[PDB]
Chain length 70, copies 6
């Protein structure tokens, strides 16, 4: 599928923290940036995610806030 | 001032497209990646955002999905 | 791409409301159900969406609430 | 309450996966479609949800993305 | 309808900014707090919102972040 | 940091429900109103949140729906 989400950032899985219904996936997207994703354990298994998997952090633009230094 | 959001990615504003009540801010976060943010025009004005401003893309972890090529 | 979003519902575009930076796409997903999506105009253009296009409504499970009567 | 969310899809609960603080409710909304909802266990209990319960999948329009096929 | 959303805060509409497909509604929920909501123009009209309307700010718990000084 | 999120409501933590990867923090914002927040356990630990802590409920405007009596 091709998605409307304005943010689709390629990266490598560096860690997966497993929970009961959700887990947290951390993706190294390069340049010293990492993105954490809280998704269903079901999806983590269905996408075959492991440490080292190539993947994408997918973020709808309406979910992104802008911050600045004080 | 300090936020629970797991994702707070520093970058520079490269573009601002103004809309009626919302605008879209694009941030260069380095490593060849850009992030687009759809936020209120009032916030764009209140934060003083301009092309070239230093800022952060702030994303709650529950807002991030994972995709794969799945070839 | 294959996506983690639990909800990926096939449908046909029945209307597109064009706005300034966002638009609203309505999808007929069958069963008498329609889904409205508020997305960027840029994405509406890049995906080539028109009335009659085949598409999918994609929703992360953490975005779905449950209501009852 | 009457809610602004553009998407309020009636369906029947087909499964509930209970966890420690959250659960996943799956709704059959007809037409061969199901919707999964990740919500708090407290909300699942307070709403009295059971398999077979009549309910609604409620989705704000700004939460919905559009996808197309890879060859499109 | 009764909703799973953990946050349902009563208030009065103090401002409405109209846009193309969305508008922003400001609700004074008492105690000096106001909540701003960006929703479709269609919903603003369908709910009959005006300055002075009684309404509720409805927020899913997974949408709320915590900040500290 | 200063954030674009239009909703930033001060309160005190009244309860924290712990899970494996997420927890639910309840904030008393006064006036008989409480706000529940489902966030990562890692964030709850990093922010030092306790029962009694002073904090803020932070909500993006696009995450807020409006309801009315019917």
């Amino acid at each position: 599928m091709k998605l409307s989400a304005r943010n689709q950032l390629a990266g490598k899985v560096v860690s997966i923290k497993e929970g009961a219904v959700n887990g947290i996936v951390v993706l190294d997207i390069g340049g010293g940036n990492q993105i954490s994703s809280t998704i269903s354990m079901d999806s983590i298994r269905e996408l075959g995610l492991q440490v080292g998997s190539d993947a994408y952090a997918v973020i709808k633009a309406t979910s992104v806030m802008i911050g600045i230094d004080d």
